Design a protein around this ligand. Sequence first.
Ligand SMILES: [Cl-]
Ligand SMILES: [Cl-]
Ligand SMILES: [Mg+2]
Ligand SMILES: [Mg+2]
Ligand SMILES: [Mg+2]
Ligand SMILES: [Mg+2]
Ligand SMILES: [Mg+2]
Ligand SMILES: [Mg+2]
Ligand SMILES: [Mg+2]
Ligand SMILES: [Mg+2]
Ligand code: NA
Ligand code: NA
Ligand code: NA
Ligand code: NA
Ligand code: NA
Ligand code: NA
Lengths: 156, 140, 154, 95, 186
Amino acid sequence: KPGAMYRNSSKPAYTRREYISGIPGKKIAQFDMGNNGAGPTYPAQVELVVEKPVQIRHNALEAARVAANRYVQNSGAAANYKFRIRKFPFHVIRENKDGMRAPFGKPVGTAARVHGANHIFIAWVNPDPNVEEAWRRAKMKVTPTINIDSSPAGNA
Amino acid sequence: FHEMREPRIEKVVVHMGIGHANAEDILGEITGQMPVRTKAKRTVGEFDIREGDPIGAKVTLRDEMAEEFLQTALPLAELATSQFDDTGNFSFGLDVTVNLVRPGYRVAKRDKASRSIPTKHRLNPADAVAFIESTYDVEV
Amino acid sequence: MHALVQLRGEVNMHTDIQDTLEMLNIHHVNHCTLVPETDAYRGMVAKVNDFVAFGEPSQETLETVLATRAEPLEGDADVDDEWVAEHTDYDDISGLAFALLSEETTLREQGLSPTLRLHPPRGGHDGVKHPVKEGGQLGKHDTEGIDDLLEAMR
Amino acid sequence: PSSNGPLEGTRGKLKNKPRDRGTSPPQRAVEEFDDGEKVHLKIDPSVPNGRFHPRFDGQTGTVEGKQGDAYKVDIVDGGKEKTIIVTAAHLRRQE
Amino acid sequence: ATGPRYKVPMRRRREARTDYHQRLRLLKSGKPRLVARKSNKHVRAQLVTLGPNGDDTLASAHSSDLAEYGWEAPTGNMPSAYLTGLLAGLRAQEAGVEEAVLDIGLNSPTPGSKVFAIQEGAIDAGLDIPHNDDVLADWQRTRGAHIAEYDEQLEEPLYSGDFDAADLPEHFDELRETLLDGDIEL
RNA sequence: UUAGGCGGCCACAGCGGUGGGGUUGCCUCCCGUACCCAUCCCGAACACGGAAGAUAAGCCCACCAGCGUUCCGGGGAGUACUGGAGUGCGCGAGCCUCUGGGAAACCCGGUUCGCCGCCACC
RNA sequence: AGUGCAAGAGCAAAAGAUAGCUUGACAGUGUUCUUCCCAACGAGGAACGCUGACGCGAAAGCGUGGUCUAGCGAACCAAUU
RNA sequence: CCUGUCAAACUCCAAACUUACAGACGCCGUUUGACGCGGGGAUUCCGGUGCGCGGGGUA
Ligand SMILES: [Cl-]
Ligand SMILES: [Cl-]
Ligand SMILES: [Mg+2]
Ligand SMILES: [Mg+2]
Ligand SMILES: [Mg+2]
Ligand SMILES: [Mg+2]
Ligand SMILES: [Mg+2]
Ligand SMILES: [Mg+2]
Ligand SMILES: [Mg+2]
Ligand SMILES: [Mg+2]
Ligand code: NA
Ligand code: NA
Ligand code: NA
Ligand code: NA
Ligand code: NA
Ligand code: NA
């Protein structure tokens, strides 16, 4: 199913698991990537900034993350960098799969609500921005247009 | 300062935690005054499901009745240290507990304007060992 | 004291906004009233802010308008100096105007209609879809700003 | 509403902020009002008795006689006149 | 204490001085309260009314200012209590007070207790108070007979120096007698 | 208020901690069970009777801000949100301007270790 | 925590627990709110009185069933006081 | 200790705003009698749209 069905934040927040059952597990494998043993003790810090509030299905998060980290293997399986996806798919989504009678759908997935300007991804690297590239591929698999922003890094 | 800071025995509770009694009799003679029933709470597998139910007795002794008892109880006990309260108490043994404290305790036991005893005015394990050990026996 | 001029009609405007205009004695487009600057009056003009034009007019302007569009509580009679002197506490229009501006009296108190029914603005006004700060004609105006509108509607 | 009992939708108005929790001071439960006085109606979550229908919480009526220790306040619901039987515990002097 | 949500009891509850549930039932009568209070050495009796910023004491009596009338005996006993009640009851009358209800605070409703002696005193002073006669002591005990008899089992004076050796419930009568006519502050 | 009783507001008063105070007078702890009364067992408590001793508790007095709380300055912030208006922008989601209101978190610095009423009293 | 049972709310010298005692889960008749916001409409419900008789308590007082909001039924006919 | 996120059926907080009563101005009423009271006669109980706020629904 298309992102068109769930990319807008027009519905009420629906996240109370105490009143919702049968919610599908998330496809997001990890949130901390790279040298998670080390702390953000890096010279450079780039972030992927979403430019519009939207809803991002755990589907897109996993594909976006994989495509970025899977690529960050331009530095090696145990390379020197740490990657972080700060958002979690809290918002439960339904689908009305009778016609419009008794239409409250059934849980079919989850999605994370990101507001325009938040960073969904943050990487930490030494002057070796291959990460900038890992993100051109990341925002490629998420609905919104995105801004690739660098913070600690006046080494231009 | 002292005199009103020096420990003293306030009640010695002798109780026999049985599991369902005929035992009161011996408590009455060992102490010198009537025992009190020991009801239990909660329903449990040791065929002890009855809420209100005699399951042992106790006896709270005060003043001479407490000394005249310890003047034989203590001798039948050896232990000391670690086996002492953080408030200067200790139980040994059929159980025999000795509650110790200093002169102004009624402040915490009375009805009107009651209050809790300040930590400083409390009795420490150490200050307790001294008092008792200094009364016919030895510590550890 | 501010000069109030309704520049937008009644159709589709909130009722509670319309009643306000009515409480301020304005019942038609281009109708103008003079309102003291008080807490109570201030709240009212603010509520009516999007369908009117208001501001403090200059002595002169007020005089021009008074002379040109003032009316007795009843009748055609022209409100000229003579009228003013033979009917009011003051001796001439200028005297009246000053009093109004300094908020010492009111058009009723002097047996005059609370409303100065103005003429459409000669040359057209700046638009009723945008405020002054945006090139429009709605909202608070400059004393020079209000004067132009009032004068154009003399 | 899914139901129509008196306490429907009263979760808020009949609950105390954690700190105002517990038995309330007796001073205001004994307060005496005179006929004609204006009194604000507000239920004390902590005080069970002497209550009035939650829908009137917020009203400001006029004391006009009492019934037992309870007072009879006149209020106007929308455009209807009504009399409310309420104890001091739930009233406050206006001004 | 612990957090923003924590609930701190009322000051007079923390101090374990006022029983607010009883207080409210007391304030129900709409009558003044006859506050009966004790101390190891003394006994106090007040007639309190309700006020805007707190209670108003319109009349009081303390077992200490009892000597001010000829008391030469201890002041933490039964005869003491009654008299202190009668004294406060009288000053009460002077103040224009006609009735009241007995507030014994945190004390126990034990029959023949000093608070009830306080209540009997105030009543005889002329104050109208809701009571129950057979919860009161039997007059003799009020007189202080129980103490005289106790000194009979002498061998050593019950009173260290004080007054008398065999004590005097008669001293009691002389005083009640005194309080029942004229004299200052009454 | 050189120590008390009854309260109002019910943490500005809570939690924790330091120092000081009783020679006759007050509160206590304290001493003690013939009585009224009392412990499903204990004068522990409750109740009654009393001063040999003490200021160590409590309590009263002076003070500390580490925690909790109340209010204030500056910053966050005229941000977030919002009542009224718009032939302003945007494929749209949505945004912007004018007008009237206006926050929360958090940081830094102050404040707060109760206030007040009635009665009694070297 | 507990308070019979949904959910939300109330409650700590208690509305909870224990003990003891008691039958107010009483008869009569109302006021008011609710049912039905506003705004007419029955049964039902609740709050708050009074009259009478009682329970407990030293007493103020508390008890018009269970802390509060669910647990309810017209006319005709029968049986019953 | 540090570090990453949330709530229609969460709340240590908390608007704009809505709302009871009162006073003030305004407007209105006392020959156009308002507010209110009593009675006669209805029609009406398929609605729709814009904007704001919504809930459902891919729409
Ligand atoms: Cl009501
Ligand atoms: Cl007392
Ligand atoms: Mg005319
Ligand atoms: Mg032209
Ligand atoms: Mg134009
Ligand atoms: Mg000291
Ligand atoms: Mg009830
Ligand atoms: Mg039939
Ligand atoms: Mg039958
Ligand atoms: Mg609303
Ligand atoms: Na079907
Ligand atoms: Na994209
Ligand atoms: Na309360
Ligand atoms: Na038993
Ligand atoms: Na001391
Ligand atoms: Na009915």
